[PDB]
Design a binder for this molecule. Structure first.
Ligand SMILES: *[C@@H]1O[C@H](CO)[C@@H](O[C@@H]2O[C@H](CO)[C@@H](O[C@@H]3O[C@H](CO[C@H]4O[C@H](CO)[C@@H](O)[C@H](O)[C@@H]4O)[C@@H](O)[C@H](O[C@H]4O[C@H](CO)[C@@H](O)[C@H](O)[C@@H]4O)[C@@H]3O)[C@H](O)[C@H]2NC(C)=O)[C@H](O)[C@H]1NC(C)=O
Ligand SMILES: *[C@@H]1O[C@H](CO)[C@@H](O[C@@H]2O[C@H](CO)[C@@H](O)[C@H](O)[C@H]2NC(C)=O)[C@H](O)[C@H]1NC(C)=O
Ligand SMILES: *[C@@H]1O[C@H](CO)[C@@H](O[C@@H]2O[C@H](CO)[C@@H](O)[C@H](O)[C@H]2NC(C)=O)[C@H](O)[C@H]1NC(C)=O
Ligand SMILES: *[C@@H]1O[C@H](CO)[C@@H](O[C@@H]2O[C@H](CO)[C@@H](O)[C@H](O)[C@H]2NC(C)=O)[C@H](O)[C@H]1NC(C)=O
Ligand SMILES: *[C@@H]1O[C@H](CO)[C@@H](O[C@@H]2O[C@H](CO)[C@@H](O)[C@H](O)[C@H]2NC(C)=O)[C@H](O)[C@H]1NC(C)=O
Ligand SMILES: *[C@@H]1O[C@H](CO)[C@@H](O)[C@H](O)[C@H]1NC(C)=O
Ligand SMILES: *[C@@H]1O[C@H](CO)[C@@H](O)[C@H](O)[C@H]1NC(C)=O
Lengths: 540, 522
């Protein structure tokens, strides 16, 4: 098994503590209450911070102070009647508030916002410019969790809202769901373990004709109790089943195990999926990066694997899985036993042109996909081994941010990894004839002085947002958001050797000033990212 | 998942080393102390060291036994495609018999052979014996060999191609018996670790590919055979074991979901520790997995016990394995020795009825796993690239000889020393971590092979002998002088104590507490 690589550089709290921090204050002048940040996102030039009872915004381009100030504040507190109801059902005072868990750009003028609303999930439209709501409230059931601690997915595609959460207060009825967009609402088959077995929802992406969902669940291929990572497709144009079969349910839902393994005399799999990026074009290919850990009761380890959207689409064209008899191993269904038209193919697809919508699909096709949602094959990662590995630390790798246009010629790919302990890992994607990774830097960004207050010291990174124009990576914790500089250039000061050795696409040696500097689009800008060559230099 | 322990204590170039010189590379395979002699088994040779006369910085050999392969065997070895380095006689078996000879087996250039030698002169005694099934062909392979009541128990491969792994018995004026050839239910690519003699049985410790968990998953196993097994009947298991049964060994961290350590590394001989007969064993995770090692302890009663439970079975092909209902196990019950409790009617296994014989041939595996002593690992190590392998135990350590100290070797020449806590075996206290590889005296042509080949703890000389491929190292059981009264007491090390008559720490103490009440500070 692969040894842990060492980073070229390390940054401790001593240096990082000078990074600007947002803690929810407007500019007008010591009251401190934990923010309960849930997620962050950048739209246009505005950073949105979704939290308890609020969404704060920071205008990125005009924020230069050491304390990052809130620019506009959206306020949405639960009605007292809902708070009281929440408490009577036995929930605690801290959790019976409105935690914002869905925040989406519906269009240029409109935000779609959903909050737990004291275990009575609710959604609203908000004006982008005034952050005031307009129109009727929308039901939140199946669109937004009740409990802020739960993981959930929401995404718009073509006006339709795709969501994944639980429909019920008791958190028993986990669902992948679609609504809005003037199309029928669709859901996964309630209480059906072949469709979903205690899923934990991680990510969805919109690609080609499909929405793909990433998640983990108890694996039926193991009937003692093992969690597998999954990706699933649904057709964007799905209209539900016929009056006889899968009425009001998906007719295109299929899923496959994700393969993130280390090759050996018996493969070792990373099964506990932590995060997945949006689709990123890296080196001609369309790809997602995904972080995995070993089970929490196991010896701790983490990995990043990459997946080509092409390999993902391809797994759904292969054989389906089945149990020929109860309590037997799972085998591939022979294609001769697969109905026509093929389950999981979209109406109007090649050879399905006869079908106006999935409502016209034959019963054999529908009963089949209802009883065979799982594919035989697992999706292979690019390179068939993890791009990055950590095995000798106590923390797990979690969030991911990617810059596929780093450097003078915008042709390096830099990947940032967050962790449950506030450490960020920075690495360079090896490319070409994508060949793994180079560990550039490790850095502790958690700032106890600004982030540890109101009885909270929670170093779990909740989100990371990379922003090129401000040369920053925004790193969210529960109680704060930190503005992290993309490259620690001037660190190396006037030492040319450590500047060149860093192999950091964000940094170069500028002899006109005699110093290591960040890209300034001008003077000479020397770097050697491909090789680390410092022969004839030194030292420090 | 549990975090690692730091030792209470973490220079080792001044230790006496043996490199095979008389006064004025060895490819060591094993060491063992017999009476007052340390035997060093190696390539083409066996070396002896007088334990109680060696005090120089270099340990010298007293007598040397030489047994090189005949040239004809070397040349045949090469012609079969083996390399120059492997085509020698590597000594892999070395046992003291009751008639006072040494029984020695060597790979003999891929043509395993055995011989008796005189203990006094180390000269051959009588004719060579066949080595097939008694000793491996390949020096890199792990093998078991043990005498009990004159019968020789051995585990290895019988064939040049190493396809036919076997647990075998011969000699002792008793039938030769073997495991059923090519029968995966019996053995499935086993890796042999240790055997012990206990009660009416010999117990074999080993690892193999698990039939119950069919992706290739390796499980650790303990198997029994009856010392008095005479083989099957004329029509069932005629020349095979009639008592072979095995069971998974359980070494896991407690919780709702258990994490198992599966790759068995080593097992001690049976050891008495406060009224109980136990073995300690080291395990690691598979080699391409996240690295980790564990020590689990086992009571011989719990091992005896699994063999009385329900057997495992596949009620139908490719199904999950389930326990057989006791209503279905024949009489006599499979695996109980002839002459036993309910088996007085049976003189030898040759009389067992076809029905129980057919059943045991088909059901060598028990449903249940042997639990460890507190149902949890005695010790855990996970933050490191090495794995825990060899084990040596001193169950009568200290002035009052009432302390149990455990030493663990590793594949990287690091040794770990523990006190065994005793509950009202309540775990372990991490006393010390020491690197003892002497690169100066042990390296050879630039290369440093830091794998520990064997450890032998010797109370009488206060030493732990640690064997590497190239040297054996004489390690002080207690590094008392290293530690100042406070430091000394707090070490809680049973071999070390404070003597104010020298104002020093030497071979006053509180081992049960680091009690530094009113002392210090250094
Ligand atoms: C297996 O081995 C372990 C130790 O290696 C034993 O575990 C401890 O057992 C002792 C005996 O009861 C416990 O001692 C108690 O310590 C308390 C202080 O807190 C301890 O435990 C916490 C976590 O629970 C740790 O964070 C902390 O560091 C301490 O270790 C004291 O408050 C207690 O003292 C009080 O009671 C005594 C009489 O009982 C009075 O005389 C005192 O004045 C005082 O009022 C007590 O001494 C200890 O808590 C146990 N746990 C641990 C982890 O230390 C197992 O018992 C042992 N199993 C056996 C013996 O079979
Ligand atoms: C997980 O992905 C790996 C990497 O492709 C697969 O490994 C292959 O497995 C077969 C034997 O099982 C070999 O013949 C190939 O050579 C392996 N590696 C390569 C380089 O492709 C593995 O099988 C996958 N696991 C699952 C469950 O699909
Ligand atoms: C990144 O972009 C630059 C474009 O200038 C590439 O650098 C040049 O690569 C060419 C070959 O295509 C070399 O012959 C030149 O000497 C390079 N110019 C420089 C910077 O000195 C670079 O190869 C690209 N790196 C990638 C794709 O990883
Ligand atoms: C040293 O050698 C002698 C014989 O040469 C071993 O013989 C033991 O003798 C006693 C008394 O006759 C028996 O009860 C034991 O069964 C013999 N060995 C054992 C313990 O099984 C003796 O064991 C050897 N060991 C030492 C250190 O004396
Ligand atoms: C290995 O040993 C452990 C510890 O004895 C066993 O763990 C018990 O398992 C049962 C069923 O899963 C639990 O309900 C108990 O609470 C566990 N601990 C104890 C002792 O109460 C475990 O089952 C063993 N594994 C195997 C395969 O036998
Ligand atoms: C986005 O912001 C920019 C300036 O930050 C502004 O010029 C532009 O009009 C905005 N576009 C919108 C509102 O989508
Ligand atoms: C060891 O012996 C001493 C005195 O003989 C005693 O005080 C101590 O409790 C003993 N330690 C044990 C039994 O573990």
């Amino acid at each position: 098994f692969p040894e842990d690589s060492e980073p070229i550089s390390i940054s401790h709290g001593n240096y990082t503590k000078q990074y600007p921090v947002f803690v929810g204050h407007k500019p007008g002048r010591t009251q401190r209450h934990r923010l309960d940040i849930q997620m962050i996102m950048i739209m246009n030039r505005t950073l949105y911070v979704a939290a308890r009872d609020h969404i704060y915004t920071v205008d990125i381009d005009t924020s230069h102070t050491e304390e990052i100030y809130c620019s506009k504040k959206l306020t949405w507190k639960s009605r007292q009647a809902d708070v009281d109801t929440c408490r009577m059902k036995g929930k605690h005072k801290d959790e019976c508030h409105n935690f914002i868990k869905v925040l989406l750009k519906k269009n240029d003028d409109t935000l779609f916002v959903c909050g737990t609303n004291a275990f009575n999930p609710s959604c609203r439209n908000y004006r982008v410019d005034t952050l005031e709501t307009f129109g009727d409230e929308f039901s939140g059931m199946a669109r937004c969790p009740y409990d802020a601690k739960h993981a959930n997915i929401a995404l718009f595609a073509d006006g339709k809202l795709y969501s994944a959460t639980v429909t019920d207060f008791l958190a028993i009825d986990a669902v992948i769901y679609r609504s809005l967009g003037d199309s029928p609402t669709l859901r996964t088959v309630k209480h059906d373990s072949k469709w979903l077995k205690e899923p934990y929802f991680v990510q969805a992406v919109d690609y080609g004709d499909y929405i793909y969902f990433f998640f983990r669940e108890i694996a039926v291929e193991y009937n003692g109790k093992v969690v597998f990572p999954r990706v699933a497709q649904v057709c964007k144009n799905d209209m539900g089943g016929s009056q006889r079969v899968l009425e009001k349910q998906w007719t295109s839902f299929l899923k496959a195990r994700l393969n993130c393994s280390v090759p050996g005399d018996s493969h070792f799999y990373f099964n506990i999926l932590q995060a997945v990026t949006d689709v990123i074009r890296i080196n001609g290919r369309d790809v997602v990066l995904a972080t995995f850990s070993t089970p929490y009761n196991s010896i701790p380890g983490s990995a990043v694997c990459a997946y080509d959207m092409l390999d993902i689409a391809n797994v759904f064209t292969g054989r389906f899985k089945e149990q020929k008899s109860p309590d037997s191993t799972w085998t591939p269904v022979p294609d001769e036993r697969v109905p026509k038209p093929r389950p999981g193919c979209c109406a109007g697809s090649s050879s399905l042109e006869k079908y106006a919508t999935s409502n016209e699909f034959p019963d054999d096709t529908l009963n089949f996909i209802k009883t065979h949602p799982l594919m035989d094959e697992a999706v292979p990662s690019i390179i068939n081994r993890p791009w990055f590995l950590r095995t000798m630390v106590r923390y797990r790798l979690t969030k991911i941010a990617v810059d596929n246009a780093a450097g003078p010629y915008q042709n390096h790919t830099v990947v940032f990894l967050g962790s449950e302990k506030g450490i960020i890992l920075k690495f360079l994607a090896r490319i070409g004839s994508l060949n793994g990774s180079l560990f550039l830097e490790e850095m502790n960004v958690y700032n106890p002085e600004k982030c540890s207050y109101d009885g909270v010291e929670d170093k779990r990174i909740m989100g990371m947002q990379l922003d090129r124009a401000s040369g920053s990576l925004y790193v969210a914790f529960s109680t704060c958001v930190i503005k992290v500089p993309l490259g620690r250039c001037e660190r190396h000061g006037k030492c040319k050797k450590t500047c060149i050795a860093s192999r950091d696409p964000y940094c170069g040696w500028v002899r006109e000033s005699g110093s290591c500097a960040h890209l300034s689009p001008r003077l000479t800008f020397e770097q050697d990212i491909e090789r680390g060559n410092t022969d004839g230099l030194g030292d420090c």
